Nucleic acid binder design. Structure first.
Lengths: 49, 46, 192, 186, 226, 80, 17, 54, 126, 142, 61
RNA sequence: CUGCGCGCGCGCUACACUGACAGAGCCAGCGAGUACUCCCUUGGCCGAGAGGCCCGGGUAAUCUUGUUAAACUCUGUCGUGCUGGGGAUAGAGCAUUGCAAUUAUUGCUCUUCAACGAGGAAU
């Protein structure tokens, strides 16, 4: 996937899933940047599906 | 006085057009089923 | 003059409310409320940032037009706004002078004196009313009657407050506050 | 000294300035008409009677102010003139369309005195200016009569003059002795 | 005085606006009504006689028919058609309902019971051709909606006899009158003493609520020249 | 005793295209009463026909009344 | 109720006297 | 900045202009103490010499 | 050599510098006159020290005020505090102490907040 | 005495200037005046109808009181709150066609000038001259 | 039915009055020797002037 | 609509005259912001608007930004009428983000103009 909006820590990530059902399945998963930054999928986003 | 007719259970929505009432019922049942599915999937994930 | 407009330099002599209305000859008609209707220290506009809610009876020292303003800012949507309330008081006093050719602070003080209920009932028995509660109830009844008579009508709160204040000063039963005071006194007379 | 004069035409009055001669304010609160726009000798308060029978009295400032002081709806038939008293600030008079002229005071919600005696439309009237003529009223009607009343005894007219024409205008003279009744072609 | 010009058009008789306390009127408050929802129909003595007789709690109390016949009386009375009548209902649950004078109620008890259930659950009944609410469940107490210049009386039995004409002559010129009529079958007068100024009794005999309000409204029409 | 009341009969109900009720209000507030006519639309109609906003409805002559009833039929013939 | 208590006892004693 | 004595007195305070506040300085307010660029107000005799040279 | 007195004035977050010098009688706030800078109803709050003290005290001074922060009300209260404290400090330094004490007595008899800013701390009923 | 416009209060100045630019009859008015709104953040058009003079006077004074200003600053200044209906208010810039055309109008009348030397628009020396002159005129009515 | 002005001598502390009602001992303004205790609602202090309508009864608890 | 176990909870917006609208006055404070880059953006045109476009200052108490913010203040318009209070729902159009906008991301324009007349008992 690809970042969409980037705040200090929480970034919104766009081109990875297709629906909030898939995100709710992959909730809490260990997401990672190419650079080495670790992270965690926190919550599905409502308005862009 | 121009008297009016009272339109009339709390458990049921009242709407003349069956199409609009049925579309709202399908949207409500879809929201309920989606919330139940997300809750079951999240508890299985934890 | 340092920097002063012509109206202020004209009425440079004494302390005048809104630079137009004097405090010199104002007589409080009831003997009981001379302590609690404070016209002794004069003020220019009612917007005075004073801590008059620290302890008990400190509101017996703030000037009575500041009490009228602070009770005018009383509902859910008029809560923060004070310049609106002092503008309503200024417009209402101008309308009182145009309708009566009388001193508007004299009209307002006579209205508060005439609108205080003299005895009231408690859940039921009938007791007397302390003078501070008489002033509080008079100001609350006047502003509540003004806004409830300006609720959905074409008249604004300034015009309705001015007419309520003139009617209360005359003592006529056209006013909400005089009618409510007579209702409370007749209920206390019924119980006794 | 002031710079206000009022001209009523149709359903609105228009307070004009004396120096600038522009329409300073246009007051169109009236439902149907406005038959005389008369401002008080103090110069802050305009009275005007409509075609529906109400009269509205409202404060005007120097600028755009139209705040309604009082409204009376007692005539229930049009009021053609409503005039202030030249000496007192709260007393005014009203000649209505039916048969009545009547004295109001501004704080009260009731007409203080009622004068009947005309048989047709009464449509022009004035107070009587003078030190001795404190409370006398003249009004002429469309019944070809000019009547002058004492306001102390609300019976009939003190004096009555019968003309030949429907009496259109009335003015007293400032000495208070003589009076001009304008009726028809004379 | 002039002879007060003849009205060439018949009047429309607008009812009293809600902001108006200037006018003189008659408020009738049907206190201690019994409008209970059973499940959805009002709890009456028609079909619930077995339920209330089994659970042994005052079969005579659950009567909405008193409220129905009394509200029928007050809406058909000419003091309502003239527009000088304002009517409130108090139920035993603490529900206080303002009834607009501009409503015409269903005359039959089945439609009335369905309408009262819909009112008690939706807090309002809108008109058919009008958007203004006709029956409105409003806030307690009664004195927020009663006028400030008014005499709150209740129709009793132990109180001394007055004639209705002399009492509503004893009312002043700007003074309205609120009567507290007990719409219950059997009960004491204790239901309203937090609000009543004085108790009166209008005949030696015992009367029903419908004829009590009938007597009071027809006396008020005779004394207000309707 | 003879002054022309040729204008004093104006506070009566006028008839127009669709609505049969149009009394005196103003000239632009009377145009809102016709259905489909708006509050911003009514000011454009008056600036073409050389009628003043100060006047009322009923203060117009039998020629000046119908000039607003042609231009309410075809808004395209007068430019827009 | 202390003052009312001693007041009613005063009245009892007064009737006794 | 937290553990700063409000009554401290160095003698460079009589030969420096302080950081001030936004109210005293104005729109051109940074928290940096302004330094000298090396220029100085130059007396009339030396400017007479320089302008004769120019 | 020049007579100059700089006085601060304070409210919630509205602060005012007033520099008072020997002058002809002008009062300027942010480069605009005192009859211009306020909401139209709070100019009577601004003119309070001038009308207490009289205009003869302000006949000799020239006051220049800068304000920043706060809202309209806080800025008006800061301006009137800077005006009152500024003329009292000028009369302290450059004319007699009896005139300083007379000015202080008149201002304290009217309103103490023209001289001493009282901040609103948090101490409710403990 | 001597005069500026800073010696005259906002409203009576801007109204005096509005009455002057109006009287003058030289002004350009675009033509889409009357049929236009002032901002996307407004409900109704202006109530003065012919009103472009009011903003022209307000703009010209705003520019006199400072160095240079551009269309973007004026849109930001003349904008206010838009009700987004049932969702919170937010500040919204006013229209840049109004302000830019006003600037071009007042430029062609020689009361302001381009300032590409820094950006924006500066008050013209003849703009100082005419504005100070009407500011005097306002104080001469009083 | 006249109106008797009166003034507070002492507010009373341990009466046991219900709620906002406080008993108070008041001395008359015409004949300052006669003093009675009366019930008073609202905030009252020592040495202030009340207005009362019925003088004949001494107020209970 | 999150959460807890058509039902529920946190909310936003209103029911107007201490108001809506239209001019006009005009005032904060805590922030943030672009390197191996496209961040915060002034001003100049174009555009009704949203926006477009040409340049421009800023790695920053230095430029945006005095963040000219909103309630608010004034001079007008409207007049108690579901009214110009309210702005849901809906049609048609133009734009911006993005590889993508249908199930309408958001923005603007016209039009459509619902419930809601102070919330009941309780808590």
């Amino acid at each position: 996937g690809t970042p969409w909006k980037i705040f200090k820590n929480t970034a919104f990530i766009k081109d990875m899933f297709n629906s909030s059902l898939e995100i709710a399945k992959f909730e809490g998963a260990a997401i990672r940047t190419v650079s080495g930054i670790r992270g965690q999928i926190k919550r599905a986003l409502s308005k862009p599906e | 006085i121009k008297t009016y007719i009272p339109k009339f259970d709390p458990d049921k929505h009242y709407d003349p057009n069956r199409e609009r009432a049925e579309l709202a019922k399908l949207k409500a049942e879809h929201k309920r089923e989606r919330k139940g599915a997300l809750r079951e999937l999240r508890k299985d994930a934890q | 003059y340092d920097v002063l407009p012509k109206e202020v330099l004209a009425e440079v002599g004494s302390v005048k409310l809104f630079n137009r209305w004097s405090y010199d000859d104002i007589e409080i008609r009831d003997i009981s409320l001379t302590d609690y209707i404070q016209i002794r220290a004069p003020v220019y506009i009612p917007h005075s940032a004073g801590r008059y809610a620290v302890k008990r009876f400190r509101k017996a020292n703030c000037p009575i037009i500041e009490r009228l303003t602070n009770s005018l800012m009383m509902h859910g949507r008029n809560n923060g706004k004070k310049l609106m309330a002092v503008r309503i008081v200024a417009h209402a006093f101008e309308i009182i002078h145009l309708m009566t050719d009388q001193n508007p602070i004299q009209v307002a003080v006579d209205a508060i004196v005439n609108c205080g209920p003299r005895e009231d009932s408690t859940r039921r028995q009938a007791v007397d009313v302390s003078p501070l509660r008489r002033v509080n109830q008079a100001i609350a009844l006047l502003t509540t009657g003004a806004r409830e008579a300006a609720f959905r009508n074409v008249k604004t709160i300034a015009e309705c407050l001015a007419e309520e204040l003139i009617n209360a000063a005359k003592g006529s039963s056209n006013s909400y506050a005089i009618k409510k005071k007579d209702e409370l006194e007749r209920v206390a007379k019924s119980n006794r | 000294t002031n710079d206000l004069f009022a001209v009523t035409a149709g359903p609105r009055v228009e307070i004009f300035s004396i120096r600038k001669r522009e329409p300073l304010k246009t007051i169109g609160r009236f439902d149907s008409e406005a038959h005389c726009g008369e401002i008080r000798p103090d110069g802050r308060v305009l009275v005007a009677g409509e075609d529906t029978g109400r009269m509205q009295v409202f404060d005007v400032g120097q600028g755009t102010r139209a705040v309604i002081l009082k409204t009376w709806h007692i005539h229930k038939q049009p009021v053609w003139v409503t005039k202030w008293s030249p000496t007192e600030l709260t007393t005014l008079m009203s000649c209505s369309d039916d048969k009545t002229v009547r004295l109001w005071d501004l704080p009260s919600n009731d007409p203080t005195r009622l004068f009947t005696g005309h048989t047709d439309y009464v449509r022009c009237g004035a107070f009587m200016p003078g030190s001795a003529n404190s409370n006398l009223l003249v009004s002429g009607s469309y019944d070809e009569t000019v009547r002058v009343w004492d306001a102390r005894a609300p019976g009939g007219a003190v004096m009555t003059f019968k003309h030949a024409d429907p009496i259109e205008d009335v003015l007293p003279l400032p000495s208070g002795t003589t009076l001009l009744a304008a009726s028809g072609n004379a | 005085p002039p002879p007060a010009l003849p009205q060439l058009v018949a009047e429309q008789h607008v009812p009293i606006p809600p902001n108006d306390k200037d006018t003189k009127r008659l408020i009738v408050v049907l206190s201690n009504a019994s409008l209970e929802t059973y499940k959805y129909t009002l709890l009456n003595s028609d079909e619930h006689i077995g339920i209330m007789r089994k659970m042994n709690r005052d079969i005579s109390d659950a009567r909405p028919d008193i409220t129905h016949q009394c509200l029928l009386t007050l809406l058909d009375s000419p003091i309502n058609k003239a527009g000088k009548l304002q009517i409130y209902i108090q139920t035993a649950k603490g529900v206080l309902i303002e009834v607009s004078p501009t409503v015409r109620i269903p005359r039959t008890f089945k439609r009335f019971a369905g309408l009262m259930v819909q009112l008690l659950h939706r807090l309002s009944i809108k008109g058919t051709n009008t958007n203004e609410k006709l029956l409105k469940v409003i806030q307690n107490p009664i004195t927020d909606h009663l006028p400030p210049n008014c005499r709150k009386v209740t129709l009793s039995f132990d109180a001394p006899l007055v004639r209705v004409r002399d009492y509503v002559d004893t009312l002043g010129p700007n003074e309205s009158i609120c009567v507290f009529v007990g719409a219950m079958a059997k009960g004491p007068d204790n239901f309203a003493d937090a609000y009543v100024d004085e108790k009166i009794s209008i005949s030696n005999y015992s009367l029903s609520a419908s004829v009590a309000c009938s007597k009071f409204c027809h006396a008020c029409e005779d004394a207000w020249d309707i | 005793s003879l002054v022309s009341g040729e204008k004093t009969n104006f506070n009566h109900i006028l008839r127009l295209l669709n609505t049969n009720v149009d009394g005196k209000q103003k000239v632009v507030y009377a145009l809102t009463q016709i259905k489909g006519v708006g509050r911003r639309y009514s000011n454009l109609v008056c600036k073409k026909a050389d009628v003043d906003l100060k006047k009322r409805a009923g203060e117009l002559t039998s020629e000046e009344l119908e000039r607003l009833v042609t231009i309410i039929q075809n808004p395209l013939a007068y430019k827009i | 109720m202390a003052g009312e208590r001693i007041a009613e006892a005063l009245e009892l004693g007064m009737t006794d006297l | 900045a937290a553990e700063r004595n409000e009554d401290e007195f160095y003698f460079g305070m009589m030969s420096r202009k302080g950081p001030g506040s936004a109210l005293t300085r104005g729109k051109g307010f940074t928290g940096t103490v302004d330094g000298d660029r090396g220029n100085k107000a130059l007396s009339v005799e030396t400017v007479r010499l320089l302008k004769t040279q120019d | 050599s020049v007579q100059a007195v700089q006085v601060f004035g304070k409210k919630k977050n509205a602060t005012a510098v007033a520099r008072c010098v020997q002058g002809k009688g002008l009062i300027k706030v942010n480069g605009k006159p005192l009859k211009l800078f306020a909401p139209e109803i709070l100019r009577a709050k601004l003119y309070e020290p001038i009308l207490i003290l009289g205009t003869d005290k302000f006949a000799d001074v020239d006051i220049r005020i800068r304000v920043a922060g706060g809202g309209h009300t806080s800025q008006v209260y800061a301006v009137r505090q800077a005006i009152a404290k500024s003329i009292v400090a000028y009369y302290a330094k450059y004319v007699d102490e009896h005139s300083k004490n007379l000015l202080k007595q008149e201002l304290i008899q009217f309103d103490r907040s023209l001289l001493v800013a009282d901040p609103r701390r948090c101490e409710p009923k403990k | 005495g001597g005069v500026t416009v800073r010696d005259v209060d906002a409203h009576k100045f801007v109204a005096a200037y509005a009455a002057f630019l109006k009287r003058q009859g030289k002004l350009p008015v675009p033509g889409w005046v009357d049929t236009v709104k002032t901002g996307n953040a407004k409900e109704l058009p202006p109530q003065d109808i012919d009103w472009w003079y009011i903003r022209a006077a307000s703009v010209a004074r705003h520019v006199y009181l400072r160095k240079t200003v551009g269309v973007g600053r004026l849109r930001k200044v003349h904008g206010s709150a838009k009700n987004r209906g049932t969702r919170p208010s937010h500040h919204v810039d006013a229209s840049g066609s109004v302000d830019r055309k006003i600037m071009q109008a007042l430029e062609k009348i020689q009361v302001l000038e381009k300032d590409e030397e820094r950006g924006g628009r500066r008050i013209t020396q003849q703009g100082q001259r005419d504005l100070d002159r009407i500011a005097q005129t306002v104080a001469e009515a009083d | 039915a006249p109106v008797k002005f009166v003034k507070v001598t002492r507010v009373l502390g341990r009466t046991g009055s219900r709620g906002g009602v406080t008993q108070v001992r008041v001395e008359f303004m015409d004949d300052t020797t006669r003093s009675i205790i009366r019930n008073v609602k609202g905030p009252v202090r020592e040495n202030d002037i009340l207005v009362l309508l019925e003088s004949e009864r001494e107020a209970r608890r």
